[PDB]
Design a protein around this ligand. Structure first.
Ligand SMILES: *[C@H](O)[C@H](C[C@@H]1CCNC1=O)NC(=O)[C@H](CC(C)C)NC(=O)OC[C@H]1C[C@@H]1C1CCC(F)(F)CC1
Lengths: 299, 302
């Protein structure tokens, strides 16, 4: 079978804490003796529209920050700001700290989101970084500071911290250095993203997944050149396919014995003609949030 | 749509996963207090798979034949018993990571999170719905048996599924944590067919309530129906009939929207009888049936 699968979240759950400043409560990430969280926690409703964060932060004391790990308050013994992330130093180190790194992911890559409220893990799901640097998440009030991550071996790579929702219902946030993905800003304003495109290499990986699991009504005898496929892809607001993408798809091509450019010809036919009421792996739409790696590992 | 399949955080279950080996056969087990629970077919050879005599296979087993490991650390087995299709292995250490837990038997239509594991190591977590024909659409490879499905309420893990097998159609079958299969299946390496599947009506209704909550309500009509009339129509479209429990679990969403359950049933009946006519609901022309009423409230209101 084939399913959208998140990484097991236990290593991250052990790091989630609650951070409160004033009447604002959200989540923080407690690694070693530092708690990371969105800096907009220091805002009031009057500050959010055009917050001078350096100004607002110098006017704060360590004791204006309440950090709770379950039933226990942690003492904040220092604070700093790195871009849009506030760093709170605490006197206790987290024994549950996993091996970890901070990474900045590329558009098209996927990661798992651990959605939390009041420092408590609530759900886990898989997201992709959209080409327009939004994510199609499920985040409600109080979810800020929830993080996204991947796990390689025993190492957790943190790639996302959650900051906001856009009026279209998609979401925006930063890496763990506090730099936004995309042209967004942590102020209380209605922000639009650039035109989104579909992640072509992922659609192809998903089509290969559908074949593996015995679904192949969409295949065809035709083939296409890389450039001719890319011309059609761009017309339909699909990302262009690179030779590295073709290479990355090799394993799935070998496994099924379907040349990448043959699958490209099937996708071209789908873009031009549609699905005709049919479905692929249950979906009436082409899915683009599975990477080739995601498909390989699970098949 | 604004919805996605969301699993429960898996950490409380990760802390309970172990591996159980007989000979060269390794599957996963669930370690709670001083008991490890796993599929009984761990005691099978390749040759026992066809039609195992589990009672006879077990009588030849001793505690010292079971290798239970948390990671690479052996857990000594001090007693063993069979309960339906599950083996219970008493071990000499109480799991310090045991959460508050209970064992529950879910109904078709209900959803749960699966922590897919191999050699006692978790690989991924995803949401499943129990189909009306008592299969799930999982993603399981060899060595996945003993992976469990669960829900988490407050601090309490309700274990509802343990994985045992794949069917020729590629769907999956298993037991509750008391070893009783969901559906008519048995743990033997034979060809077994699931009954024809049907659409989970209560979840489609939940989906329609979700659409209403988000302002998408063109499909609401001025009519109502009796539960019996709706069920008889529903069955002609390969939809499951509603139970009283289904009506009850739609209560919170009916109260949130002010739309009586039976009025929503009449709206669904009209969609079934007239089709969508090129319209969409929550962005789709397909009705979703794997979000329960609880799932909807989770993602709309938190
Ligand atoms: C943090 O928990 C919070 C998460 C949001 C809340 C709802 N769903 C989420 O993912 N983030 C925020 O509250 C931020 C805070 C700013 C300082 C960045 N703000 C928003 O995410 O607001 C969403 C905008 C679409 C809403 C609206 C804002 C006011 C307006 F500008 F007048 C009109 C548009």
């Amino acid at each position: 079978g084939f399913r959208k699968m998140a990484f097991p979240s236990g290593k991250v759950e052990g790091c989630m804490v609650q951070v409160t400043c004033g009447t604002t409560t959200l989540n923080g990430l407690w690694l070693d003796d530092v708690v990371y969280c969105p800096r907009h926690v220091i805002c009031t409703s009057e500050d959010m529209l055009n917050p001078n964060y350096e100004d607002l932060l110098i006017r704060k004391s360590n004791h204006n920050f309440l950090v709770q790990a379950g039933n226990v308050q942690l003492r904040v013994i220092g604070h700093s700001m790195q871009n849009c992330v506030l760093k709170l130093k605490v006197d206790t180190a987290n024994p549950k700290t996993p091996k970890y790194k901070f990474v900045r992911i590329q558009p098209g890559q996927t990661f798992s989101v651990l959605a939390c409220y009041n420092g408590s893990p609530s759900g886990v799901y898989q997201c992709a970084m959209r080409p327009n640097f939004t994510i199609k998440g499920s985040f409600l009030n109080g979810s800020c500071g929830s993080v996204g991550f991947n796990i390689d071996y025993d190492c957790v790579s943190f790639c996302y911290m959650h900051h906001m929702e856009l009026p279209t219902g998609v979401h925006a946030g930063t890496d763990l250095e506090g730099n936004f993905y995309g042209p967004f800003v942590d102020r209380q304003t209605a922000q639009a993203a650039g035109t989104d495109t579909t992640i072509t290499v992922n659609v192809l990986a998903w089509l290969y997944a559908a074949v593996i699991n015995g679904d192949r009504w969409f295949l065809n005898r035709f083939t296409t050149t890389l450039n001719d496929f890319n011309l059609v892809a761009m017309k339909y607001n699909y990302e262009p396919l690179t030779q590295d993408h073709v290479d990355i798809l090799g394993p799935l091509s070998a496994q099924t014995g379907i040349a990448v450019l043959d699958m490209c010809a099937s996708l071209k036919e789908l873009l031009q003609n549609g699905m005709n009421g049919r479905t692929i792996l249950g979906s009436a739409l082409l899915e683009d949030e599975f990477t080739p790696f995601d498909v390989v590992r699970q098949c």
